[PDB]
């Protein structure tokens, strides 16, 4: 319905862009998430982030992408009404930190994330903000891409887009190094980080600044050179004085992962965006041969 | 360092589906009591100048025009409000497309205070309501950039001339509202290629698009006439824009006198 027909249950969230309530429709009983956007603080009208979020979510109808149910646009306020899901993946990981997420569930979640992401890319949408708090799980074993506020429709070929995008820990090296062009590979990098994080129970590259982020990546994957990544030494933010670190063996990086898992992760973390694995190709990786859909323990 | 290949075919197929869904009603101007194709041409020509003044992307211009034609498809508008519709449309297109959309006060300025900020923002709300926030429309520009990939190596002059021809189509609702953006892009690409290199619409594009050179003909006949008559047209902003070296001064190139066809 409309605003008087929603009963606010609890504040479940906030983020750089919006304020989110769990709410219930007083007429039909339906539980929803209400993302409230303030126009009054806005003397520039409707925010670009909301315009993109709405227009793009309306085009993306997929089992692994959060559903937008309604948009209530008043003079003072903008509400996006979403289906409600139990929790985000960050909260699940935190609750799983002592025990660990069972391997079959990790494989299921990654498979579903890749399906959602492949759908986005095939619809010319870059998410640009993939991290655990933007991913939503239900009680039945589903996980869904959410939070499209940073998303963008992209051109073929791409042009230069906003330099300040992904949350630091999940941010791809081509962005850190200042490339004028980035594309779908940035989302794959983020997912690779999240995959590793589900496996080891900790963020793969928890940088506290852009240089620290870059060096954490270099220390793990080796400092890239012209051979692994042609053009890298010409990137705007690259410096020849960067320490040169050797690549670590993934047995050290993601000990619990089998050969197939390590293979897939290494392809998602490839330095050269042009050779980084696509969401579509990732779905065909041997790692997913046995994939099932277990129920999470909540 | 651009990469497009794995999902590229899917994107083209999807855009072909959405251009049909985002198409304005072809006959809408006959149902407008107060506004005409000539007023619309003046409006679009002005938006071209606004885009130049604010260094906006060509894509932003194409989107704004799509928004305008769709809004006018369902909403009667008096001539004194047409510029308000156009201004709100350009603001919305900028918010969608640009890294840095100009602020509302700047759009107010550029109309010379014809409308207030309150009006522009209220019109933004109405346009959003009328378009149901469906802002991600395919444009002639999006199809052009995909077609350009079929030139190896790239020819920057052909690309500039194709963009110029594609932009000229925005001005004149009659004939161009009859054609889908993918088809206009195809005619513009061929005409540009032919003018610059003497070559013709490539089989690779005929396969991908389903358009044979033959099927481009009707639109091509129109675009060729438009091209020939461009220095005489009442609206001049696109020609002025494409005289610049960044565009290889393609608007100064002489059109072919005849089409081999």
């Amino acid at each position: 319905g409309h605003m008087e027909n929603f009963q606010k249950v609890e504040k479940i969230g906030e983020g750089t862009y919006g304020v989110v309530y769990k709410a219930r429709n007083k007429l039909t009983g339906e539980v929803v998430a209400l993302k409230k956007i303030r126009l009054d603080t806005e003397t520039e009208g409707v925010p670009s982030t909301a315009i993109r979020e709405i227009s793009l979510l309306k085009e993306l109808n997929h089992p692994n992408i959060v559903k937008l149910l309604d948009v209530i646009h008043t003079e003072n306020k903008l509400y996006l009404v979403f289906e409600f899901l139990h929790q985000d993946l960050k909260k699940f990981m935190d609750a799983s930190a002592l025990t660990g997420i069972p391997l079959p569930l990790i494989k299921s979640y990654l498979f579903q994330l890749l399906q959602g992401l492949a759908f986005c890319h095939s619809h010319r949408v870059l998410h640009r903000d993939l991290k655990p708090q933007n991913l939503l799980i239900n009680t039945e074993g589903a996980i869904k891409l959410a939070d499209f506020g940073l998303a963008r429709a992209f051109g073929v070929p791409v042009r230069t887009y906003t330099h300040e995008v992904v949350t630091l820990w999940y941010r791809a090296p081509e962005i850190l190094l200042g490339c004028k062009y980035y594309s779908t590979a940035v989302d794959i990098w983020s997912l690779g980080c999240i995959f590793a994080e589900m496996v080891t129970r900790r963020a793969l590259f928890p940088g506290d600044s852009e240089i620290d982020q870059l060096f954490r990546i270099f220390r793990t994957l080796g400092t890239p050179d012209e051979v692994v990544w042609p053009g890298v030494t010409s990137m705007p933010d690259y410096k020849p004085s960067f320490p040169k670190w050797a690549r670590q063996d993934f047995s050290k990086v993601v000990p619990p992962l089998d050969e197939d898992g390590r293979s897939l992760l290494s392809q998602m973390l490839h330095y050269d965006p042009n050779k980084r694995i696509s969401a579509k190709a990732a779905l065909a990786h041997p790692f997913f041969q046995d994939v099932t859909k277990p129920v999470p323990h909540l | 360092s651009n990469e497009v290949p794995d999902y590229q075919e899917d994107i083209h197929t999807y855009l072909r589906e959405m251009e049909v869904k985002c198409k304005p009603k072809v006959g809408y101007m006959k149902r407008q009591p107060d506004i005409t194709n000539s007023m619309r041409a003046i409006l679009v020509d002005w938006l071209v100048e606004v885009g130049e003044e604010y260094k906006l992307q060509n894509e932003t211009l194409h989107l704004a025009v799509n928004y305008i034609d769709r809004f006018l498809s369902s909403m009667s508008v008096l001539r004194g409000k047409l510029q308000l519709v156009g201004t709100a449309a350009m603001l919305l297109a900028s918010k969608f497309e640009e890294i840095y959309p100009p602020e509302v006060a700047e759009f107010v300025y550029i109309t010379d205070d014809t409308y207030s900020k309150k009006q522009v923002l209220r019109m933004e709300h109405l346009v959003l309501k009328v378009l149901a926030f469906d802002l991600a429309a395919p444009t002639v520009n999006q199809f052009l950039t995909q077609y350009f990939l079929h030139l190896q190596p790239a020819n920057c002059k052909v690309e500039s001339l194709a963009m110029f021809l594609g932009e000229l189509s925005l001005i004149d609702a009659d004939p161009y509202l009859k054609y889908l953006p993918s088809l206009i892009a195809g005619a513009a690409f061929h005409l540009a290629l032919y003018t610059v290199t003497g070559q013709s619409w490539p089989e690779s594009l005929a396969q991908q698009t389903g358009y044979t050179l033959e099927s481009l003909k009707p639109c091509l006949v129109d675009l060729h006439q438009t091209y020939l008559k461009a220095p005489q047209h009442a609206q001049q902003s696109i020609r002025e824009k494409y005289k610049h070296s960044k565009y290889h001064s393609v608007s100064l190139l002489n059109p072919p006198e005849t089409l081999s066809v």
């Binding site: 750089t16 940073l150 330099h163 300040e164 949350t167 630091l168 999940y170 | -």
Partner: peptide
Amino acid sequence: PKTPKKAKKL
């Protein structure tokens, strides 16, 4: 980890 804001123009 907080989502980044667009840098100010210029």
